[PDB]
């Protein structure tokens, strides 16, 4: 099933890699990885949860407290309130950048089981799954 | 068994000797004791060593016992477990060499004066210590060094006039800091370290509103759903959120989280 | 053309204060302090700069609360992957944070929520 | 002894904590509330209560949690059912699970002493805490998960936080759910959940 260095779940290949990089390049990083390739992707109550949260807990061994998975902020804009508390439509915004947390990780706590959302820029270690090869 | 009362259930063997007015320990104890229950009793002394015969001991109470002198002498191998409250210690017995399992030790409501260096030395897997009710002024620093997996400390109701700045330092698992009811005025400049306090108490303390309370002012506001108030009721044991209950100058006045700072830089 | 205590510009009342409180509570207060007000709502650079001088009284590096809030839940997200979800079981799965101006230059941080500050209401009359 | 016999056919005789929640809100009148804790004496009353049994506690939350009730209170059945039926009435503004639910993951189950006993914190929700307070409602329920602590909420009326129910539901198995409409339907179906409750947890491998 899964090529060597995979461990396989639900007719899946995941894959912890233990290389720091943003996002972006992680994301790249995964589907160069294998055809159908990407960060993966966690079906929010099955099996699978813990299955990611194993697979990486038991092997991320480190200082690190984030994992990238496939899940982001598909809205444009730097913030998702289009109108102000008042109604006005948010036209001129002017937020600090690295403020803006569109991507989500595993958080370290409790087995890497819990989402959040980061700073994209953020160079943390990934998981990747792709569709048996 | 003549005098105390045996249960067994599951890994463990429960003797209970506890309001038997006992001035010593027993005898004839079961061998596979795993906690045992020498609470309100008499036993104005008692001896560590005396247990050795047990191994399997996890859990020795001794709260409520009018005791002046603890003998650390000896050694048992599992105890995780010591509860030396109420009674009357003039000083905490160093168990970092007889007690290593030990997880949570609790020797509130005794008469400490103050605290030993090295005084946890030795307590490695200690989580829980509880030192309320007592006379301690000021703590030694570097402290709960050789306790960094500790998760609750009850510094409650005592003396306490000045925090050791790094206390907290190293720990990566407090979960309850008690330190409400003292005679507290200031706190040192980042004292909570970047930690994650669910719970802290801080009331019943005369905080000096000047300009060195702002690092506690800030801490405040940023935390204010970690502001708990300790408060018992005969039949009531309760915790609430309030961070307006940390106030300079105590009663029910003014929060130090809106103490204004004017005059400060 | 506005109540003492406050300011006027471009037609609006807008007022600070030095009370501290969550995003949450700073709206509640806004709101309750002149019909028709809620937290200030920057739709202009010349706007921002007007309210950069009610501040004064605050620590320079602080910053106020402002009209938007919760600026990560009301997101649409998207696996890379193309998996479908049902946001229903995405509760509050995103941090719960909302916006704060800072003066000394006038730029946005995304902070979380929960936090205690000082806040600039705005109104029409 | 203390000892005490059993009321009734049903008796509850094996390893377990169970943790009696009571949502504290005036979401449920002074006359309601007293149901409610009726119900809490009616559950307690079907379990073989001691020390190395079943383990009571009762904590009412409204903006912090009142515990009349610990775990390691070694009283008799008929006491801690006394102090069950005399849970005074709180009636908040704003009751919090979510806070609730911190108490019982950082206090209540801080530590696993007597694993070979099931742990359950029964949740009994009539309000809804501001969306602002639940940011860590998740990471407390699956905290609870990783200790082993099953929650069972049970929603009363159309204030009931229907949404937080359901996820609890949601986060896993055992984590069954019961929601109702009144105060009433509750010893209406008091067997139920008790019999839930009681086939949740394990026997003494003796006997």
Redesign the interface.
């Known amino acids: 099933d899964c090529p060597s260095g995979w461990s396989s779940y639900e007719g899946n290949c995941y894959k912890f890699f233990q290389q720091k990089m943003n996002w972006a390049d992680a ?1 790249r990083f995964c589907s160069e990885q294998a055809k ?1 390739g ?2 993966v ?1 966690i ?3 099955s099996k699978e949860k813990d299955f990611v949260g194993d697979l990486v807990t038991k092997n991320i061994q480190s200082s690190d407290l984030y994992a990238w998975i ?6 444009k804009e730097k ?4 109108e ?3 109604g ?1 439509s ?7 950048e690295r ?4 991507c ?1 990780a595993l958080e370290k706590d ?2 890497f ?5 980061l700073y994209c820029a953020q160079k943390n270690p990934f998981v990747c ?1 792709s569709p048996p090869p | 068994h003549p005098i105390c009362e045996v249960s067994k259930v599951a890994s463990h063997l429960e003797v209970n000797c506890d309001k038997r007015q006992l001035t010593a320990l027993p005898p004839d104890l079961p061998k596979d004791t795993t906690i045992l229950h020498l609470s309100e009793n008499l036993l104005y002394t008692f001896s560590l060593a005396t247990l050795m015969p047990y191994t399997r001991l996890t859990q020795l109470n001794l709260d409520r016992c009018e005791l002046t002198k603890l003998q650390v002498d000896g050694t048992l191998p599992v105890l995780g477990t010591l509860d030396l409250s109420h009674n009357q210690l003039q000083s905490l017995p160093l168990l970092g060499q007889t007690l290593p399992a030990l997880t949570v030790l609790d020797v509130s409501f005794n008469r400490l004066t103050s605290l030993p260096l090295g005084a946890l030395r030795g307590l490695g897997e200690l989580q829980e210590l509880y030192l309320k009710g007592n006379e301690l002024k000021t703590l030694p620093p570097g402290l709960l060094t050789p306790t960094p997996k500790l998760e609750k400390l009850s510094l409650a109701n005592n003396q306490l006039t000045e925090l050791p700045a790094g206390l907290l330092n190293g720990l990566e698992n407090l979960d309850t800091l008690l330190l409400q009811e003292n005679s507290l005025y200031t706190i040192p400049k980042g004292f909570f370290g970047s930690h994650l306090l669910p719970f802290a108490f801080l009331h019943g303390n005369p905080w000096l509103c000047n300009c060195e309370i702002l690092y506690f002012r800030r801490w405040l506001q940023d935390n204010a759903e970690n502001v708990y108030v300790w408060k018992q009721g005969v039949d009531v044991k309760a915790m609430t959120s309030n961070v307006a209950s940390v106030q300079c100058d105590n009663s029910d006045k003014f929060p130090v989280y809106k103490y204004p700072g004017k005059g400060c830089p | 053309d506005c109540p003492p205590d406050w300011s006027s510009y471009e037609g609006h009342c807008y007022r600070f204060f030095k009370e501290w409180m969550h995003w949450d509570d700073a709206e509640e207060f806004c709101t309750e302090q002149q019909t028709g007000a809620h937290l200030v709502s920057f739709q202009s650079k010349e706007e921002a700069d007007f309210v950069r001088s009610l501040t004064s009284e605050m620590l320079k590096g602080d910053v106020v609360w402002i009209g938007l809030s919760d600026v990560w839940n009301k997101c649409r997200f998207e696996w890379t992957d193309g998996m479908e979800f049902d946001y229903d079981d995405y509760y509050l799965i995103a941090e719960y944070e909302c916006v704060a101006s800072k003066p000394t230059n006038n730029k946005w941080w995304i902070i979380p929520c929960t936090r205690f500050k000082n806040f600039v209401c705005e109104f029409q009359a | 002894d203390i000892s005490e016999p059993p009321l009734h056919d049903f008796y509850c005789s094996r390893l377990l904590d169970l943790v009696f929640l009571l949502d504290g809100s005036s979401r449920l009148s002074e006359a309601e509330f007293e149901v409610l804790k009726a119900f809490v004496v009616d559950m307690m009353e079907r379990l073989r209560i001691s020390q190395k049994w079943v383990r009571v506690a009762v904590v009412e939350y409204h903006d912090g949690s009142h515990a009349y009730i610990g775990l390691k209170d070694r009283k008799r059945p008929s006491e801690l059912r006394r102090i069950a039926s005399q849970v005074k009435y709180a009636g908040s503004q704003v009751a919090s699970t979510s806070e609730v639910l911190k108490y019982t993951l950082f206090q209540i189950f801080s530590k696993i002493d007597r694993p070979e006993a099931s742990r359950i914190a029964l949740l009994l929700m009539a309000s809804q805490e501001p969306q602002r307070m639940s940011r860590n409602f998740v990471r407390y329920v699956q905290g609870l998960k990783k200790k082993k602590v099953i929650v069972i909420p049970v929603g009363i009326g159309p204030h009931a936080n229907l949404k937080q129910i359901r996820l609890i539901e949601k986060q896993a198995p055992e984590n069954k759910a019961f929601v109702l409409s009144s105060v009433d339907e509750l010893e209406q179906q008091r067997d139920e959940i008790v019999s839930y409750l009681c086939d949740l947890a394990p026997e003494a491998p003796p006997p």
């Open positions: 994301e159908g990407h960060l992707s079906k929010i109550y496939g899940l982001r902020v598909e809205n913030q998702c309130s289009s102000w508390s008042d006005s948010v036209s001129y915004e002017n937020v600090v403020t803006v947390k569109k989500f409790l087995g089981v819990l989402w959040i959302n799954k």
